[PDB]
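Summary for the steering committee. One of the milestones for this cycle was to obtain a three-dimensional model of the protein with uridine 5'-triphosphate bound, which we needed before selecting residues for the alanine scan. The sequence and ligand used are listed below.
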Amino acid sequence: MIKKAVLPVAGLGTRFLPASKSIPKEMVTVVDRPAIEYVVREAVEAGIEQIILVTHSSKASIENYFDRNFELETTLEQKKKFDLLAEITQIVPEHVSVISVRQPQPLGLGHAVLCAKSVVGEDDFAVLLPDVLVKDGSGQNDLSRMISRYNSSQAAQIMVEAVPDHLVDQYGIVDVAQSPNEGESIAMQGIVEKPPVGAAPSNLSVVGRYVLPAKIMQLLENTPEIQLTDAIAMLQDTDTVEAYRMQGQTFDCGSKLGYLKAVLHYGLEHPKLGMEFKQLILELK
Amino acid sequence: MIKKAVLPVAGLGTRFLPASKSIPKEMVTVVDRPAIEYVVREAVEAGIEQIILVTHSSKASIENYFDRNFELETTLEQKKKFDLLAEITQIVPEHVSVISVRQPQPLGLGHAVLCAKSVVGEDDFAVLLPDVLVKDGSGQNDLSRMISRYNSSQAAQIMVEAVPDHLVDQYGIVDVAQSPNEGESIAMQGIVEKPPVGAAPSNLSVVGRYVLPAKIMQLLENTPEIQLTDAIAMLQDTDTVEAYRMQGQTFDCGSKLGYLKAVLHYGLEHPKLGMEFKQLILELK
Amino acid sequence: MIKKAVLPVAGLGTRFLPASKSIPKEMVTVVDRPAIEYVVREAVEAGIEQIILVTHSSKASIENYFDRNFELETTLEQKKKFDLLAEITQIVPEHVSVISVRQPQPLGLGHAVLCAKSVVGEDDFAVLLPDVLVKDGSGQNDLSRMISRYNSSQAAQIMVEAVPDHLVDQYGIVDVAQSPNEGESIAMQGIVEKPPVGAAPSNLSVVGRYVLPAKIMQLLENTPKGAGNEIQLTDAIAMLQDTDTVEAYRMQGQTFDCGSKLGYLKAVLHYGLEHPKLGMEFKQLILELK
Amino acid sequence: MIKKAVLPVAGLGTRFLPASKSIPKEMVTVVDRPAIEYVVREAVEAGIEQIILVTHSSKASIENYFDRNFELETTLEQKKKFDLLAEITQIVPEHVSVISVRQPQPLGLGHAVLCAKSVVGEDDFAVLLPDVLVKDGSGQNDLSRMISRYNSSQAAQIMVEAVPDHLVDQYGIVDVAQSPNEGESIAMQGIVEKPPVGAAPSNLSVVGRYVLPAKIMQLLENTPKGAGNEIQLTDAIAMLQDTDTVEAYRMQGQTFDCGSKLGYLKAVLHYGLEHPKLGMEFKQLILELK
Ligand SMILES: O=c1ccn([C@@H]2O[C@H](COP(=O)(O)OP(=O)(O)OP(=O)(O)O)[C@@H](O)[C@H]2O)c(=O)[nH]1
Ligand SMILES: O=c1ccn([C@@H]2O[C@H](COP(=O)(O)OP(=O)(O)OP(=O)(O)O)[C@@H](O)[C@H]2O)c(=O)[nH]1
């Protein structure tokens, strides 16, 4: 049922500078590969088949990464390095397609999603914010848990995670009666942006993963900058909308410390370099 | 009904070299603008709303041309040149979208179209070969004549034009009982590629404009290189397929002489420079 | 003798839109190649060895033009188009180097030439404005003549061409005593911008070809007007006047301004006709026009 | 004294895939900036003024890094992030020029340095391999020491570092008589590639930092092996031996090979810890690991 995902990648990264000065914030290297690969992986391992990049003129290198590189391939055949040729050819299955649409101007997330309207048509769809990485410890990643819940419930889904009470002021936070269990959804009434450290209706931050109906493109055409949460509220007035509580862990690769935490955590766990990396950490003091 | 058009632009141009050495053959300048603009114009003036570029890693400059250029725009505001700012902002209507999908490898036109399968879905669609320019003398361009004929007849359409008998050997040529009139279609049985100057079943060359059903994506998955005409033949075995005979004139911007003929002909007729150009020609001898 | 040339190619090409919305002005097709090829050819046929491109972050396609393209070469081999592959491989003699340096911000032509300071060092150099094409010549080209002149005289050289009396307000024209003969120089004491139709000191227009000494870099670092128009080349040449002779060289040849849309079409026509292979078939296309 | 450095940065980065599939190896994030920033910093802190990038047609992002980004600057202004805008504006001292020349085909390191011939001219120059980071130092850095050494002695200088006896087969190691002290040089008579574990002429590894005279360009034009491995730098330095002293300089500091995936992670760790702002909070992330 849910086969399309919008990845809004058009935004420059003022928060991961100068790393992203001359390359997309999404192509910054997490262990041995760009951060966007962990996000595209996440989508594909949860049944996506059309990755829709809403992109900017400065970000060919993102499209290129999921395309074939003639000169680099046919100097891994001139040399005899077919292990590597495997790492640059088979990034996503033959049946997964990567599409591009440009965001003319940076008029917000809701505007980004709306640029995708031509491509999503009547299909429901996932939204995945590339600067957030999500790490699963099971065999069903939180995007898949969330999609199967959309599929049965037919309620829009918004991935959330609890934050310390003293930082609710840094995040979108959901208006929810009771906090659901790790892995399940509750009904939600709306999102409060950056509520003061006293007056939040939960400790559950909007993490940056959504499943939404085609309907919302209409809603986005008619908001009071176009911001997503406005269209999500407008959705309240017709349908049920649930907040999904993730089982996994997040890293904001936008913040310098969230990216250094992603390198450490994803590195300890790399198939090959994990044990040799664990070693390099031990040798430090 | 017919709202999507596939523009296969992934092919390098060995025939317009060195012009296209470091820029796409499609961005070569015809009077005062890239050749791709005449083709996108053609599609939009005939009711297209999703231009689908099947593209290559070397061709960002094509996507860029239909996107906004921050630094160039906001030094036409620092300067006070709003006539020009009009020529770089309003290339295609707000409601026309430009989509990109990459052709991994150059496995032929039929492969190019098939790369578009994710985006076309069940919709019927137009195919427009960018290195051919088409010039109309009426108020209905041959792509529009051809689309309205698909719409009523439900028969796939293949734009054709008559060639001298001594050059049938340079072109795809249609197998057709009688030649239709300029502006109308006949039934056709197949295309013969480059038949010898004796044994052609008509003098009507395949010009490089099609209207096809979604069906053909299935057909293209199952051809004996994947070449379009094979899938078109396979279509014969189920549906009627008509050859449309254009009222207009062509220029192959692929050949050095067809491009010099496009500059002359399109230049004599430029809103502003037409009369000043006509002048420059007169002054020559 | 003179081995180095600065091509300032960092402009956003506002005069030639939308053609240059998304590719350099310098990569516009004149017949069958980009304009920049005709300017590099001209330099090279005058013994220039080092082409110094003062460039902008979107002008990679200029640099790619004089470099080798793997995927393009290998598709030409696979099609056994060997003469073509030989042409797109030898764009510049093998002894010719193409360098790049960035113009950080677009502060005009003197600031652009100042950006080549480190690559020019103590050498004397030509400047070629790439938006001007200069065609025609019996033997050696106008740039060669003007260089042999800089070599003998050791006077800065500024290429000028005679314009009709009623258009001298469209041009920088030079303060000279008498107009020299075609292919000769004369001392000049200033250039006036868009002089008034009545009273201009000659009919000889500044063309966009210079031979200057390294000295000029030090002068470009000490010309005012930094916030108004930023660094003006004519102001630095004015300062050179104070210690050094400066001469106006008069072309034998004929220029074409591929900055205007209408000068571009003049060039396509004139180069088209003279094209060694298409010229005759292109004349044929013209005749057939009515 | 020594004002010029060639950074050969034209490789396709096969050792560091898929990280470098679609961005230069040289633009890989080490903590919070690309690797190339650390190599340019090092050169500059040793009085290098002209950075000469020998580059490939896909390495624009390297050149864009040391240039100004209009759209990026104007979005930083609109967000009143003025300290950041000041940082991304002054990446290199204002007296430092970054030049580019293309390596037409990938024929190895001597062919790359030969591509800088026209920009080096008669000047003596450093070569810095950008895939090697060199950290640490009490006062002036290893490259400064090695340059002041090239200045006094007028002997080609090759930076070497002591490796464990059982790994000398992973390295080019130098034929020296005695190993010098850290921060000192000694005459060397050859480098042997991956010498055998038993018998190597020292434990001092070639690091990828050189000070060479212009002479070497003429030698690089006359070293054989053109079709085998193409032009080898060690072959040209061997030929320099024939007329000129050549010395091995021993680092005070410590290198990191961001060509391997595992040397990259060493660098991130060691630079992370020493990062002037994140170091302490990054140590904190390590402690919390179990
Ligand atoms: O107009 C918009 C806004 C946001 N986004 C998407 O949302 C995120 C916005 O990325 P930003 O560039 O806005 O975030 P940042 O961390 O650099 O911080 P500031 O610039 O606010 O200081 C990115 O993931 C982007 O792709 C868009 O694509 N377009
Ligand atoms: O695999 C293919 C084949 C063809 N095409 C599309 O069809 C045309 C093929 O363009 P070509 O590059 O094949 O044509 P050319 O005129 O340069 O001649 P040769 O290379 O054959 O010598 C272009 O319009 C291209 O976009 C593709 O997009 N992909």
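Key point for the committee: Chain D touches chain A through 48 residues (CB under 8 Å).
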